[PDB]
């Protein structure tokens, strides 16, 4: 699956749509990044400027110029070729193929910006602009706009309205298209496989980082090269640390591991959590903690449809979670008592669902406490944990246990698919998964 | 292997030593980096504060003072515990238990640096600080010193003078001790070991990042969690670019796969490079570039001792390179015509040899033209290479070939001792380690 | 004269009525301004913070908050009273006094700004700002803005669309009300009565400077204790310098003065120029030009009138220019070809009029080369000059003559009225006034 | 008097002579300063770059390199020649002229700096540079040793350590030399000259600021056309606020009047203050304060000279203000347990005594307290005062008097010189100057 010409230029049209008459949209690349001294990061793409183009280079941005109700143009600004940064660092598009290979109508040299941006937005009313985003950025857009404020006695005047973008563009990336659902799809099924084989190949004696490896290799080998985020493997009382990720130590028999990873398919996020035993059999206390958590997630998973809202299946899962701590007596008292007390967060701390897309912990508005209805093309993970802490004043076998079971979901016109349900979650299922493959 | 706390003692105290008396020396962190929004890659701490500390968080800063020849004292500002930010990011140091952890004699608040720092510095005549590595380090100085300036009528007094350590504590850096020596050879065997792995995977139709998948997971099975530097893996023509990162292509049969790759192992950098046809027998166009590249690393190999120079030995490289080339018909004319007229330089384009330490490309002083007198100690790379663009007005069957094949070594008293000499070069050996996987 | 309290309010007013609804108005404070060292300019603040509050501190903020349509309100951030900083730097308004002083709804300290005005800025659809025009409220206001971006688990939002106030309040500024135009009917009379003594007390052998000491004692004497612009006093050869402030030279008996000076009174700019000879005596040469300037003067203060534009009476001025110059011998040729051949730059290579107000320079939009229809309230300089450079190739005499005739007039319903006529213009009358003087 | 071309060149030598061998020291210019919007304040050149070129231009820098003990030579930066920016703004040095005028090796343009600057540290092992005095100039300067520090492959080094120069410099400013006293001593009659004016033109009715008026027209006579600080008249309670500038009040008969100004003469500042009865006669109660101050003052300046310090002074004019305030019933109880108390406080609540030279309040070190044992060729004011509150716990006649005088001497072999005693301070002799010119 990937995202076609086609939608890139659908993407730039609905922005446009929704743009003032007389105004211009500028869209800039994300820097290169340093690890250490003269060595890089890998590059990331600036989710944003991705979204509208599909273009991987620094250095470059997406001038959308809106003359009228049905006039308008695209200029990008990007790196010139040349022989000598392409023999060192890798080829470049260039201007003479921008614009067939982008879908752009003119393309400049990104060395030319303060001598060409300033034309570009004279006489406009307006600019749209994600001020702060990077400082390149408000640096060149700034030293634009003072060009045409004080160049008065040379006929240049400056839009004096400047609009975030972002909050427009945001509500475009949390509502889906076809093709992102098929690409989310993918980045579950390749997540998903990443996870079950973390699980066939645990062993006691193996460190946290080994199974990382393994996971990190299962990505790529699908064609995610990257993950969405930094890999945690939490075995023990690690799995008590919501992002631990010095995935250090030596996993033990009769600890159970908590992996939290997600692979980074054609920029989007694959997100998914599944906890297990190190060998391969859950304990009678693991598994009560265990139960309630799958309660949890199986019950928001039935919920979760277009009409409800975060807030509201979260709801249902405290409620549960009270009433399942109560019958361990991890908590004492009555549960509706408990539940207005909120009894539950010393040891479920975090929200149950967030957005997923180009980014894990991805864009959009969520409402007051997450109260936002959901709607077809919404696309979230349902993450319920628990966390007993090591010194966590409940019956000793409890304590130090981390649990975090999570999928990845697209609200339907009827309810919601997973997209990460082809990895076992069930406790039979994962210990049957684990037999089998220290048979083989 | 790793490096003790005596060791990292004993750096702190050589810098002090070199430092004048009623002096400090200010070391920072890196600072955290953003991949894509709130997001974050995997933390890199800065090399000189890695080397001084061993400590892998961000916002910290050691302070050395020398109040004379035999009184000095360490101060470390460090992030304070905080039961919240631990539950989701995992466990810190602390200042209770850093000056045993770290050896230092006083822990402070980071967040109380700049009602501290001025404290510190109120008094002494010089400060040791690396002006322009960081931003936020230089406001945190400027801040201080301002303090220190201004504050006359509270008796506060700014040292007049400012000294980069950056050459001390890079000319320390150059120089490699036994156990830094015992960390490097265990990262070049760990890198070994990788490109033995691709070479033995390697078939037609992998993409090029599956040999990247392969190298990583063995880097990660070893503990050398992250590569030094981005992989590559440039087959057919994208061998001919020197840091080609994309790897998105298909390997193709009949085309050379020019692997570049190396571990981060304990902060450590390995460094090689192999070259070897995609099916496993290397056609006689490729044996002839093949063997000029490798005798030129076989001669720089018995060349590398005390004594000599990076360009002493480049020169016997180009020598032989343009003699070879010659002989294929490559370049026309007097050898040494050719070598005054640089004439290799369309075909090897870049320096043989780079120090090798805590960044791949080390630190230290290399002398004009890398004309520095070697010395026990020193750690380089030898990395002769031939590069034949696809359009070289030369003759067809060496056209769209890059060759390159790079070892790690260290300079002994009597010579050099290869690091990376356990993955095999010749192509005879090659040949057969490929042969020997491909039954199985 | 003076600005009345409820005139400051008609102007907060009549801002208001122009913004959107949902929107607060943000008007900075001047900074103080180093002369040297510790020791500070006398303090002049920003003419815009001015108009709306006639308040005369540094380190204080207008925010006009408007709600709806029918409900808004203000607020001041300015400093806290403070008894040492006061025995000192002399008096604050506080808090306390300021919402009746300045006719205010509240005020707070500018000390807690960055804790208060994301607080007034949340949830509002636009903020008006000028952005650039000081870092230190650019600072602030950004500072504000992402506190509201990343505070949505905190219930706040930014507006997502800033406007630049300028335009709005500069179109303003640009139409002088009653008031207004009666304080700047004083400062023309105050500049007037400097012009005059200036002249009486000139002789041969007396410096330039002496002029200016003259001039800002007689600004100083009516209440106008600063000038709205560096004095110019350039006679000779210096009077071919437009903005010569030097006014270092012995005057000589045979030279023209050029006196360019204006006082600044309760905020307001006079602005006038009047040449005249040293000696109290116009030459043959001096007249000749002089008379080219002052017809070109008293026809422009005929033409300017409602309905007319500084580009249509500057090109009657051109007209009358270039037939002197013509008739001089200092042009040749056709007077119509060398007016389409703008041969008079040479000579007269400024603009003949600028707007007048709180800046002498003053704010509000020109049009295309000056082009906008005048219209009753404007006030503006009329200032015809001509400059014949020392080694210009002219007749001798006229080689190094440098005369301008500045007045200030304000646009009525039927014409103008002239601000600055009570200073002599005509050369007998000059004459008279200088002989008169030497009895004284 | 005035400072000569050797002068200038002294101080450089004498810079020179204390400066490392292979180093280079940077002098930048004052920046332009925005008085309101396109205007400018008068501009005021830097003292320290004023001191060592008399050069009277923004955008320029002094760099003496000092190649050996024997070998250095200058270099000037400074703005080129432009007919053009000369017709409007005055005359420029430019780049021909300046070695002979100013006295340096080499001229170059300062829009060429950044190309040039980086050549000319190049290889040095010290740079002076006053860090943190101006942003462009710190920009600029860390502008090229970035250059110089990354381009060592383009055999480019910079140097490690870098001296801020304002010590040293400012330790030369605080001697002053037979030129400079000169100098000085004539900032002091033009000084005094002002303040004789003023008392001789005071009368009942006027206002504050007409006295500025006088006094500034009289700076201006003599040459001065700036004062070296904001005039300060203060009439009445005005009086107790010691940096009062609004001088915006009538001043009424029974009032005393503090007047404190200085001219800049040549770039050295005047200071003087005289507190006079407006009405021309002392009351009882004015002299019974008046008294106390000049007895203070009488008294310090027959103990100024080589060998004492400010400090200590300072202790006797506690002594003599303590015994007086007791017997007026102002302070009560023991003198010595009364000076242990500082009992003196709530009204002498400054210093005695600052340096003074090219600043009011000049440069140079005064130890702890201002300790520092004194030495020929100090400049230093001496300015007793004591201010009464309008409502302090005293008897009521005393309520709202602020009462200073001000003397400016330098430190001779045997005592001390008083360069501003040619205006009168004993109140028969004040009181007989005003009723003479009442006559006027
Ligand atoms: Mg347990
Ligand atoms: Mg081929
Ligand atoms: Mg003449
Ligand atoms: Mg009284
Ligand atoms: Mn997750
Ligand atoms: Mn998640
Ligand atoms: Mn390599
Ligand atoms: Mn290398
Ligand atoms: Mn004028
Ligand atoms: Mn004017
Ligand atoms: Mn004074
Ligand atoms: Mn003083």
Request: charged residues 25%; glycine residues 8%; contains cysteine.
């Amino acid at each position: 699956s990937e995202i076609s010409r086609q939608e890139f230029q659908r993407r730039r049209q609905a922005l446009v749509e929704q743009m003032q008459p007389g105004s211009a949209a500028l869209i800039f690349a994300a820097p290169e990044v340093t690890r250490s001294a003269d060595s890089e990061y890998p590059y990331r793409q600036n989710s944003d400027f991705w979204y509208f183009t599909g273009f991987n280079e620094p250095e470059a941005v997406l001038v959308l110029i809106k003359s009228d109700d049905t006039h308008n143009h695209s200029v990008l600004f990007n790196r010139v070729r040349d022989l000598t940064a392409e023999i060192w660092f890798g080829r470049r598009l260039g201007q003479d193929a921008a614009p067939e290979k982008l879908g752009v109508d003119r393309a400049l040299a990104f060395s030319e910006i303060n001598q060409q941006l300033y034309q570009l937005l004279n006489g406009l009313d307006v600019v749209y602009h994600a001020q702060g985003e990077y400082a390149y950025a408000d640096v060149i857009v700034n030293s634009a706009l003072e060009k045409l404020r004080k160049g008065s006695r040379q006929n240049l005047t400056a839009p004096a309205t400047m609009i975030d973008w972002r909050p427009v563009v945001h509500e475009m990336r949390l509502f889906k298209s076809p093709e992102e659902i098929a690409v989310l799809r993918r980045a579950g099924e390749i997540t998903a496989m990443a996870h079950t084989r973390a699980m066939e190949k645990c062993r006691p004696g193996m460190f946290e980082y080994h199974l990382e490896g393994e996971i990190h290799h299962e990505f790529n080998r699908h064609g995610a090269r990257y993950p969405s985020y930094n890999t945690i493997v939490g075995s023990g009382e690690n799995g008590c640390i919501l992002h631990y990720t010095e995935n250090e130590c030596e996993m033990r028999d009769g600890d159970l591991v908590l992996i939290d990873a997600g692979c980074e398919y054609k920029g989007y996020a694959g997100d998914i959590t599944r906890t297990f035993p190190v060998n391969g059999k859950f304990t009678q206390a693991q598994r009560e903690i265990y139960d309630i958590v799958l309660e949890s997630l199986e019950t928001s998973l039935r919920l979760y449809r277009p009409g409800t809202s975060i807030l509201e299946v979260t709801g249902e899962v405290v409620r549960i979670m009270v009433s399942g701590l109560v019958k361990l007596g991890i908590l004492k008292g009555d549960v509706d008592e408990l539940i207005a007390q909120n009894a539950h967060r010393p040891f479920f701390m975090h929200g149950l669902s967030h957005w997923l897309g180009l980014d894990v912990h991805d864009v959009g508005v969520y409402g007051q406490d997450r109260s936002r209805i959901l709607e077809p093309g919404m696309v979230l993970t349902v993450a319920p944990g628990l966390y007993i802490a090591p010194d966590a004043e409940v019956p000793e076998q409890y304590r130090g246990i981390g649990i975090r079971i999570e999928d990845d979901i697209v609200i339907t016109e009827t309810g919601n698919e997973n997209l990460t349900a082809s990895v076992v979650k069930k406790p039979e299922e994962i210990e049957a998964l684990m037999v089998a493959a220290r048979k083989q």
